[PDB]
């Protein structure tokens, strides 16, 4: 069961936080979550890893991943979204044991609109 990444289309006003939810279950307690934006070259650019001990040293603070209380839903928030954050995003869920598996969500679109 690959993770779900919702909403499929998210429209936010520039300056607001843009918050997706990455969801997955039926996986072991030993997991890693990755948050990607699709680049102009159709390449996955890693925005954030969860938990914190998986983060690249230069991970930008504006990409916030929070595990919600039920432990299966995760908020993935762009803090103070800008017009140029408009694009395509997805999450990857990695199970580590007893079998290691990588599964990507379907892509979701973010549109960040002009504030009037």
């Amino acid at each position: 069961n690959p993770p779900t990444f919702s909403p499929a289309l998210l429209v936010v006003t520039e300056g607001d936080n843009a918050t997706f939810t990455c969801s997955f279950s039926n996986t072991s307690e030993s997991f890693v979550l990755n948050w990607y934006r699709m680049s102009p070259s159709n390449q996955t650019d890693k925005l954030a890893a969860f938990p914190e001990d998986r983060s690249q040293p230069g991970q930008d603070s504006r990409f916030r991943v929070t595990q919600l209380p039920n432990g299966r839903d995760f908020h993935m928030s762009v803090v103070r979204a800008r017009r140029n954050d408009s694009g395509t995003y997805l999450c990857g869920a990695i199970s580590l044991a007893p079998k290691a598996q990588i599964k990507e969500s379907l892509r979701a679109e973010l549109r960040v609109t002009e504030r009037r």
Epitope: S30, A49, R54, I94, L96, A97, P98, A100
Partner: antibody
Amino acid sequence: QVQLQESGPGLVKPSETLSLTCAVSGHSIRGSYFWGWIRQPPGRGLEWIGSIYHSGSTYTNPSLKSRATISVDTSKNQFSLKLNSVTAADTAVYYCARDLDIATTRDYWGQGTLVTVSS
Amino acid sequence: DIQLTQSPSFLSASVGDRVTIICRASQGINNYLAWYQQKPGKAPKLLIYAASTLQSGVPSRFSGSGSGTEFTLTISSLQPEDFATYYCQQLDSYPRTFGQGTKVEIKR
């Protein structure tokens, strides 16, 4: 980065229990990684013994499941190996490690400790 | 469980030679395989992960290729300091397994 150090007796009598501890430095065992024991008999290959998550959930080599216990003490940032009923076949350098996985770029190994099984 | 067949067992090659080491997995494991260098009296040291990704800081003469069952470690230009036993490790599942190892000695 991360440093690991094996400790325990270098000489165990046949039929007794081998006990080793791994002291982890530079980062907490509490986290998203598995922590493993690997051994190498003199001049032979690497054999994975078992691994443990900070929660205490373990995986053990099927060949050693009857004799081997992996344990973790997050209170002391250590994990440990007990191997019962030792024989000359158990003479080896014992390594503790942060297990490599497909979600990282790096692992970490102790220097290894020799255990000789002899009367 | 994953079994690994590593070949060859031992090789002697000259400084500057291209060295080829192979690990065959008992079933498809995607690119979930790592290559290690073990110098005598030292812990195994990671060279390559995800079958073909050189760990940043490892010399560029080390490369990996393959996905599924057949994995290749290449040393493009053998150096005297490359004397070691090389091991593959599968990362596909517990129980963890290593190749039998390839001992590399320098012909001079």
